[PDB]
Amino acid sequence: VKNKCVNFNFNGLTGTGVLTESNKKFLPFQQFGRDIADTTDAVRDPQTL
Amino acid sequence: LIANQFNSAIGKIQDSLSSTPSALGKLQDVVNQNAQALNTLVKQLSSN
């Protein structure tokens, strides 16, 4: 689901928030995303990459 | 003549603010002194 305050558990990594589509272009190898505070903000979904 | 001098003087100040960028640092450092420390606080979220 998108744009809903939810609980997520992606591949073990857990948390709460809202999920949306990024326009971010990774390299084909790149998976995750991290912040200045070393916190997750962008995740590749394991099912639909 | 006094009035003339006064008018001329005012214009120079505007040009002196139109030219020099380093005069207003006494304000901007204050802004920097909040824009610097705060950011470092966020980086201490990544300390084990």
Identify all chain A residues contacting B45, using CB atoms and an 8 Å cutoff.
37-39
Q: How was this entry determined?
A: cryo-EM
Distances (CA, A) of B3 to A47, B13, B16, B37, B46: 79, 16, 20, 48, 63
Identify all chain B residues contacting A38, using CB atoms and an 8 Å cutoff.
45-46
Per-residue tokens: B1: 């003549």
Token match 């002194």: residue?
B33
Length of chain A: 49
Taking phi first (over 0 means left), then psi (-120 to 50 degrees means alpha), and beta for anything else, what does residue A5 get? beta
Taking phi first (over 0 means left), then psi (-120 to 50 degrees means alpha), and beta for anything else, what does residue A12 get? left
Identify all chain B residues contacting A36, using CB atoms and an 8 Å cutoff.
42-43, 46
Asked if B43 and A39 come within 8 Å (Cβ–Cβ), the reply is no
Measured in angstroms, the resolution is 3.9
Taking phi first (over 0 means left), then psi (-120 to 50 degrees means alpha), and beta for anything else, what does residue A3 get? left
The residue in chain A having the minimum alpha-carbon distance to the alpha carbon of residue B45 is A37
